[PDB]
UniProtKB/Swiss-Prot annotation, chain A:
GO CC terms: nucleus; transcription factor TFIIIC complex
Keyword Lyase applies: no
Swiss-Prot/TrEMBL keywords: Disulfide bond, DNA-binding, Nucleus, Transcription, Transcription regulation
GO MF, one example: DNA binding
Function, as annotated: TFIIIC mediates tRNA and 5S RNA gene activation by binding to intragenic promoter elements. Upstream of the transcription start site, TFIIIC assembles the initiation complex TFIIIB-TFIIIC-tDNA, which is sufficient for RNA polymerase III recruitment and function. Part of the tauB domain of TFIIIC that binds boxB DNA promoter sites of tRNA and similar genes. Cooperates with TFC3 in DNA binding.
UniProt miscellaneous comment: Present with 1130 molecules/cell in log phase SD medium.
Quaternary context: Heterodimer with TFC8. Component of the TFIIIC complex composed of TFC1, TFC3, TFC4, TFC6, TFC7 and TFC8. The subunits are organized in two globular domains, tauA and tauB, connected by a proteolysis-sensitive and flexible linker. Interacts with TFC1, TFC3, TFC4 and directly with TFC8.
Gene (UniProt): TFC6
Protein name per its UniProtKB record: Transcription factor tau 91 kDa subunit
Superkingdom to which the source organism belongs: Eukaryota
Gene Ontology BP, a term: transcription initiation at RNA polymerase III promoter
From Swiss-Prot, chain B:
Subunit structure: Component of the TFIIIC complex composed of TFC1, TFC3, TFC4, TFC6, TFC7 and TFC8. The subunits are organized in two globular domains, tauA and tauB, connected by a proteolysis-sensitive and flexible linker. Interacts with TFC1, TFC4 and TFC6.
Miscellaneous information on this protein: Present with 125 molecules/cell in log phase SD medium.
Upper classification of the organism: Eukaryota, Fungi, Dikarya, Ascomycota, Saccharomycotina
Domain of life of the source: Eukaryota
Originating gene: TFC3
Protein name, as recorded: Transcription factor tau 138 kDa subunit
Full protein segment contained here: 183 to 625 of 1160
Subcellular location: Nucleus; Mitochondrion
Organism: Saccharomyces cerevisiae (strain ATCC 204508 / S288c) (Baker's yeast)
Task performed by this protein: TFIIIC mediates tRNA and 5S RNA gene activation by binding to intragenic promoter elements. Upstream of the transcription start site, TFIIIC assembles the initiation complex TFIIIB-TFIIIC-tDNA, which is sufficient for RNA polymerase III recruitment and function. Part of the tauB domain of TFIIIC that binds boxB DNA promoter sites of tRNA and similar genes. TFC3 is essential for cell viability. Cooperates with TFC6 in DNA binding.
Curated annotation (Swiss-Prot), chain C:
Protein's UniProt name: Transcription factor tau 60 kDa subunit
Annotated region described as Sufficient for SPT15-binding, given as residue ranges: 399-585
Major subcellular site: nucleus
GO molecular function, one term: DNA binding
Binding partners and assembly: Heterodimer with TFC6. Component of the TFIIIC complex composed of TFC1, TFC3, TFC4, TFC6, TFC7 and TFC8. The subunits are organized in two globular domains, tauA and tauB, connected by a proteolysis-sensitive and flexible linker. Interacts with SPT15 and directly with TFC6.
InterPro entries linked to this entry: TFIIIC_Znf, WD40/YVTN_repeat-like_dom_sf, WD40_repeat_dom_sf
Function recorded in the entry: TFIIIC mediates tRNA and 5S RNA gene activation by binding to intragenic promoter elements. Upstream of the transcription start site, TFIIIC assembles the initiation complex TFIIIB-TFIIIC-tDNA, which is sufficient for RNA polymerase III recruitment and function. Part of the tauB domain of TFIIIC that binds boxB DNA promoter sites of tRNA and similar genes. Plays a role in TFIIB assembly through its interaction with SPT15/TBP. Essential for cell viability.
Subcellular location(s) per record: Nucleus
More about this protein: Present with 2070 molecules/cell in log phase SD medium.
Gene Ontology cellular component annotations, sorted alphabetically: nucleus; transcription factor TFIIIC complex
Length: 518, 309, 585
């Protein structure tokens, strides 16, 4: 057959062998995922992500593959810090003074910096978890993971939030992505129990690296003195790795950083996004459209420095597999989405699409179904398998741009947040692993929450009401403008088995929110 | 045409221009180097060479009311041994001479960024050439314009697009709900969704069986085994807006006399008084729109305007 | 001397910043533009008027691809059939023969003659072994090497080309990769008797490859390493390769290694100045260029050859598109290539601002700059046709180095009487034939008297076989123009076209090279090779000498003999005056 457009893959078995190949050990995972999640339309049984489940499936990210601390850091490169008082902390990082009026169902509150609010009882069911107020622009969030075989309490878990001293203004001289900008910004590190949802701000780290994004914990940076190690790109144009050294106490501490354990930098170019290809090497993008793989052990010179885009590379993502090459995907302001193999870019570069030039394009990898998940830079969520770039399947349509996307290593549930304050959940596996014919009716999505705001009343008005949106396949792109603070800036599931039903999301005013899906 | 002979004429023509300044586009037009792109290239090169050799100086002049409307001009220096004709704009005071020597926020969507600058720019609005240049620079004008068509609107955070004219250039101008407020001369809360079923009912009752695909069973060896067998105009509106505030800043009443026309011109910001007919046209339009009441003083014959409230 | 005005390629795009420009034996440029190749087809004109457009005409070259890895599911390379719609990713012309080979996006190598496909290369093995990533042409003989995903350098070699379309067939494969390893071939270079190849893990192997040996010694000259090989070349048996921040020089006479820091991470292209007395290279990058002398020791010296021109152009452009120095700007080089004779370089480039660019196909354009690499130059036995003229024009019309004893003119001694089709081959392989072909590109009235003496001597020797009328008519014409005795024969020749037949007395063919008069009192002009009357609407025209040649594939009425058939079959495409391809109507 001349199999050259998605409509040629009419037979369900033909689709699966064309999109996923014939490696017997690879096909097992798809059968397990299908049976373990076909009935999981909007939620999944806790029993399916547990380490003993008959349907248990788990693919570790490449950074977890071997111990990295002695290679990436070690005693030769410990992070340099000093402790500080609350008076000087508040002198630089002017987090929001005036309280915000939240409404959550029937409850009002005026909520100050740090005011945890458990969900009040709501008419549509047993909501569990909390709203918060982090007090400035949440630019990124990152859940840590701990191996459940360790002596650490299986229900304790950690989360980090990167917070700007800048506020509800969306255009500022200080959030510029084009040029290098060092300024004071911070990381709030939270310890919480997945069992009782009780949470404490353990450490606050202050740094002059400017705003922080693409924030991720290195799951191989294990040492008895560390919580973990926290990795990010910063507005000073460098990649900074810093040690989250553990306290002898549950009491809060404020810290300032003089030198991070490992700084990746390059002459006359600013690094813009990054991802791990192994426990000790990272792919990264630059302002000038270049791509490079740095060695965390030998950070002086990159392994390669090749041009791949015409302008600012926005997001880079790794599609790891136990059966195929570690391909990398990239999108830029030039709108191209390219997939390539770092062994040789020039012989392997492939195009999935060209978008309208859009200044925030979330891209993530769903390792349970070997598919990239992306916003089209406008208002649709789409899936593309790494080995069949033409097989683009649209997942959901929204009236305003998709601004943040999250996915986990234990389940195929995708979370997407639009700049209208809507948060939606959908099962990507139901689209990828099944036939094309009845796609306009067999795949659906659910709104888990919606923020809203009043210009005159000045409230943030979180709506618990669930809404079902069916898949409009032939749909138009849309762009409804909405209140500056209500856009969703990040969204991520906890990926441990104990925490696997827990997720976190943030608006841009500061209203970080977590729920345990039970 | 051999440009090597004409360099002396270019310096003498600029030398003979008023105050030693000439617009480069107008200079091309005088010497008729506009007939062919071949002649255009020759002329631009000649102007650049005379600037580099210091016989002339390239200088900007900036519109006192619009920093984006700047005129490329040549200034005379010593003897030899953006394309709109701005000879209109050079007639004003226009004294903002300048001898020659990017805001894009990643985290908030582009929609909110054009909105914020269209708001921060105030009641005077902002031109598309200001928005593109300050947000993303000149190169992104394509992807910006193909994006703005999805959310800018023809005449609650809506953005309105309106035409404008300066010198000989016609361009679109952006305004927020500020326009609706100043045309009237901001929404409150909205309803919660009123959907009340338990998520368990949605995760159960919304399920539909999918097409048969790869499946498996576990053998007695504990081995996982497969089965797939069987499976009306901006200046008039701005003037009507002004005439209420120019009344109200004095009181609920005014007289339609010389010192009122002066005050309207002075609050508007003109260097010279507006023609009485131009002001009376907008006064009549807002009187007819019932924004103003008006009558003759019965003991003087002079005309009064007043707020009907 | 000033460089010619740049060739402005418009509305074309490139999919990646690799080297995209190659320059064939006949002077044809090939640019691997996306989605279709752009060919800088060569043309002749004396009034070049300082503009390169008068040498090269640019047109889309829409080849058609068929994919042997279609139907076959992708394995450890996930990208293999990821985009099923094929497009050209690499394109190289033959250095000694006259074909083109192209790597498709899905990893096939296919070989072509002009716009016609010859064969798609395939061999038995697993899916990865059938998938190619780099290929190279033998610099001495009709054969090709292909590097596959299994890490095997596979050989194919060529036969059947005289009888029918050239057969490309599978011969053997050296597994250069370690047993069960997953690394694959990325670069191959082949200079004289030595082949050098680089795998993905940066391991490099040098080996002598010859028809006389079955057992090439795969001596690994550089261990597996972290830094990627950006470029690889052979320069007077020294291997040269570059990586981010470094240039590595290796001597294959003793397998010793050496290094120098490049001082920048921008990609460096290696430009080997092969004709220089001391092995030397120019290194080129989007921001800086310099000359490295490859003696026993390395060195850094000024790129006085190329850099001054690029700096002038960049300053000129900056004066218009960056007059305030508001933007950081770069010289993007989409490709660099040496002329087939090695005396000139072609650089394809554009000047750009680092910014939020959103380009589109209609706004994209490129300048091709042609420049001389030396103060003196000579003919080369590799390059043919308009390739000689290209170098002559690039050197500001400065004449080549002629022999001191020969400065027609030379008409060198020819003590030969080889088999007839091969005799014409040996005749065209001679140095004296090459300088005559170049001289015709310079003089006011072209001539071929030296070549005619070779055919006269052959006909005079082969007197016992000149039995055919047309063959005799050709010989008589040669004898008369040469002022040497005409062989004795009598009677009338008959010649035909699709509607008309004319009888000519053999004596009616006077010594005049221009015209002939028929027995019916009708005048006709003589053909540029067989000297016969031009009676048909099917002649090919020489773009240099304006002469006409009868297309033997089109004639179906004239009863040509062995001499006439053999002459035309050997000159049905290549010009007898100048080596150029004749135009067709």
């Amino acid at each position: 057959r001349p199999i050259r457009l998605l409509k040629d893959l009419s037979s369900a078995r033909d689709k699966i062998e064309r999109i996923y190949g014939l490696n017997k050990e690879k096909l097992l995972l798809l059968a397990k995922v299908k049976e373990g999640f076909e009935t999981s339309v909007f939620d999944f049984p806790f029993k399916n992500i547990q380490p003993d489940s008959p349907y248990f499936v788990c693919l570790d990210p490449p950074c977890k593959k071997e111990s990295a601390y002695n290679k990436v850091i070690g005693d030769k490169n410990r992070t340099v810090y000093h402790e500080i008082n609350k008076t000087e902390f508040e002198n630089m990082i002017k987090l929001r003074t005036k309280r915000l009026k939240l409404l959550i169902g029937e409850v009002d509150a005026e909520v100050s910096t740090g005011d945890k609010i458990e969900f009040p009882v709501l008419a549509n069911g047993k909501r569990r978890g909390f709203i918060y107020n982090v007090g400035g622009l949440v630019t990124d969030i990152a859940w840590l993971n701990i191996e459940e075989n360790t002596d650490i309490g299986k229900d304790i878990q950690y989360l980090a939030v990167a917070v700007s001293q800048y506020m509800d203004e969306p255009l500022n001289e200080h959030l510029e992505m084009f040029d290098k900008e060092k300024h004071s910004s911070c990381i709030q590190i939270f310890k919480m129990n997945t069992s009782t949802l009780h949470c404490v701000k353990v450490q606050t780290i202050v740094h002059s690296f400017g705003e922080v994004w693409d924030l991720k914990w290195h799951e191989g940076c294990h040492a008895p003195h560390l919580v973990g190690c926290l990795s990010f790109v910063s507005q000073e144009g460098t990649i900074n790795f810093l040690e989250i050294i553990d306290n002898a106490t549950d009491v809060h501490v404020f810290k300032m950083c003089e030198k991070p354990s490992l700084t990746l930098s390059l002459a006359d170019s600013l690094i813009t996004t990054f991802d791990f290809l192994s426990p000790t090497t990272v792919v990264c993008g630059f302002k000038n459209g270049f791509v490079a793989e740095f060695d965390l052990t030998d950070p002086e010179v990159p392994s390669f420095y090749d041009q791949v885009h015409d302008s600012y590379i926005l997001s880079v993502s790794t599609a790891y597999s136990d059966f195929e090459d570690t391909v990398v995907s990239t999108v830029a302001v030039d709108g191209y989405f390219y997939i390539f193999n770092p062994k040789d870019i020039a012989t392997t570069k492939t195009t999935v699409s060209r978008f309208r030039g859009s200044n925030l394009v979330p891209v993530v990898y769903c390792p349970q179904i070997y598919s990239y998940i992306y916003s089209d830079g406008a208002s649709s969520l789409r899936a593309v398998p790494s080995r069949a770039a033409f097989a683009v399947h649209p997942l959901v349509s929204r009236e305003t741009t998709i601004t943040a996307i999250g996915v986990s290593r234990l389940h195929p549930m995708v979370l997407a947040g639009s700049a209208d304050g809507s948060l939606i959940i959908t099962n990507a596996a139901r689209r990828l692993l099944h036939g094309i014919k009845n796609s306009s009716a067999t795949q659906k999505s659910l709104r888990l929450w919606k923020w809203d705001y009043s210009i005159k009343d000045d409230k943030y008005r979180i709506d618990s009401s669930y809404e079902v949106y069916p898949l409009t396949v032939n749909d138009v792109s849309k762009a409804k403008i909405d209140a500056h603070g209500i856009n969703i800036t990040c969204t991520k599931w906890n990926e441990t088995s104990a925490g696997g039903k827990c997720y976190a999301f943030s608006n841009s005013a500061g209203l970080l929110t977590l729920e345990y899906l039970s | 045409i051999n440009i090597r002979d004409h360099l002396a004429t270019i310096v003498e023509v600029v030398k003979r221009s008023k105050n030693g300044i000439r617009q480069i586009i107008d200079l091309k037009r005088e010497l008729k180097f506009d007939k062919e792109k071949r002649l255009s290239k020759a002329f631009i090169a000649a102007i650049a060479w005379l600037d580099e050799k210091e016989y002339l100086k390239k200088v900007l002049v900036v519109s006192p009311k619009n920093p984006a409307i700047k005129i490329r001009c040549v200034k005379y220096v010593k003897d030899i041994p953006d394309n709109f004709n701005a000879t209109d704009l050079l007639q004003n005071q226009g004294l903002v001479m300048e001898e020659k020597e990017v805001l894009l926020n990643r985290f908030y969507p582009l929609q909110n960024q054009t909105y914020d600058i269209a708001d921060k720019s105030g009641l005077k609005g902002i031109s598309t050439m200001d928005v593109v240049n300050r947000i993303t620079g000149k190169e992104f004008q394509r992807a910006f314009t193909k994006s703005s068509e999805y959310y800018l609107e023809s005449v609650g955070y809506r953005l309105f697009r309106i035409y404008d004219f300066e010198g000989k250039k016609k361009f679109f101008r952006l305004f927020t709900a500020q326009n609706f407020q100043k045309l009237t001369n901001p929404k409150g809360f909205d309803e919660l969704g009123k959907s009340r079923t338990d998520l368990k009912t949605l995760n159960e009752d919304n399920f539909v069986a999918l097409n048969n695909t790869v499946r498996f069973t576990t053998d007695s060896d504990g081995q996982d085994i497969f089965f797939w067998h069987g499976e009306r105009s901006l200046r008039s509106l701005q003037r009507q807006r002004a005439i209420l505030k120019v009344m109200n800043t004095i009181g609920g009443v005014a007289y339609l006399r010389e010192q009122f026309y002066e005050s309207v011109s002075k609050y508007m910001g003109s260097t010279t008084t507006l023609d009485k007919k131009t002001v009376r046209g907008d006064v009549d339009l807002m009187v007819e729109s019932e924004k103003l009441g008006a009558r003759t003083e019965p003991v003087s014959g002079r005309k009064i305007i007043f707020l009907p409230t | 001397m000033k460089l010619l005005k740049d060739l402005l390629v418009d509305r074309k795009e490139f999919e990646d910043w690799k080297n995209n420009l190659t320059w064939a034996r006949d002077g044809t440029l090939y640019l691997t533009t996306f989605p279709d190749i752009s060919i800088g087809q060569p043309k002749y004109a004396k009034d070049i008027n300082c503009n390169s457009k008068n040498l090269f005409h640019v047109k889309e070259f829409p080849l058609e691809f068929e994919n042997k890895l279609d139907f076959e599911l992708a394995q450890q390379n996930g990208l293999l059939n990821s985009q099923p719609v094929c497009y050209p990713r690499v394109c190289k012309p033959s250095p000694i023969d006259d074909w083109m080979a192209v790597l498709s996006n899905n990893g096939n190598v296919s070989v072509f003659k002009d716009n016609k496909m010859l064969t798609n290369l395939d061999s038995k093995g697993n899916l990865s072994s059938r998938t190619y990533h780099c290929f190279e042409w033998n610099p001495i003989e009709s054969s090709i090497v292909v590097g596959n995903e299994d890490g095997e350098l596979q050989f194919f070699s060529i036969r059947k080309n005289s009888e029918n379309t050239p057969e490309f067939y599978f011969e053997s494969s050296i597994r250069l990769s370690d047993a069960g390893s997953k690394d694959w071939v990325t670069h191959i270079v082949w200079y004289e008797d030595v082949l050098v190849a680089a795998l993905s893990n940066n391991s490099v192997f040098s080996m002598t490859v010859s028809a006389s040996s079955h057992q090439p010694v795969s001596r690994m000259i550089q261990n597996a390493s972290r830094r990627k090989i950006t470029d690889l070349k052979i320069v007077d048996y020294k291997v040269v390769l570059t990586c981010p921040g470094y240039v590595h020089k290796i001597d294959l006479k003793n397998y010793s290694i050496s290094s120098l820091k490049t001082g920048s991470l921008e990609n460096f292209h290696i430009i080997p100045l092969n004709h220089e007395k001391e092995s030397t290279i120019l290194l080129m990058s989007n921001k800086t260029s310099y000359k490295v002398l490859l003696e026993d020791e390395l060195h850094v010296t000024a790129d006085n050859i190329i850099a001054p021109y690029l700096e002038k152009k960049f300053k000129k452009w900056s004066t218009i598109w960056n007059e305030f120095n508001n933007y950081e700007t770069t010289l993007v080089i989409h490709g660099i290539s040496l002329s087939p004779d090695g005396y000139s370089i072609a650089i394809v480039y554009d000047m750009e601002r680092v910014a939020f660019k959103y380009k589109i196909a209609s706004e994209q354009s490129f300048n091709i700059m042609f420049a001389p690499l030396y103060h003196t130059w000579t003919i080369s036995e590799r390059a043919v046709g308009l390739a000689w003229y290209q170098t002559y024009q690039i050197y500001n019309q400065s004449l080549p180095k002629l022999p001191e004893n020969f400065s027609k003119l030379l008409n060198g001694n020819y003590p030969i009487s080889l088999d007839f089709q091969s005799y014409l081959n040996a005749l065209m392989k001679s140095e004296e034939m090459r300088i005559i072909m170049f001289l015709n590109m310079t003089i006011d009235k072209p001539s071929i008297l030296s070549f005619l003496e070779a055919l006269y001597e052959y006909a005079i020797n082969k007197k016992s076989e000149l039995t055919n009328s047309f063959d005799l008519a050709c010989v008589l014409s040669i004898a008369a123009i040469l002022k040497r005795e005409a062989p004795i024969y009598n009677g009338t020749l008959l010649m035909k076209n699709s509607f008309l037949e004319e009888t000519f007395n053999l004596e009616s063919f006077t010594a005049d090279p221009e015209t002939v008069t028929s027995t019916t009192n009708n005048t006709w002009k003589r053909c540029g090779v067989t000297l016969l009357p031009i009676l048909t609407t099917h002649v090919k025209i020489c773009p240099v000498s304006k002469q006409r040649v009868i297309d033997i594939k089109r004639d179906d009425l004239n009863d040509y003999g062995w001499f006439t058939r053999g002459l035309l079959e050997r000159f049905n495409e290549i010009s007898v005056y100048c080596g150029t391809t004749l135009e067709v109507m």
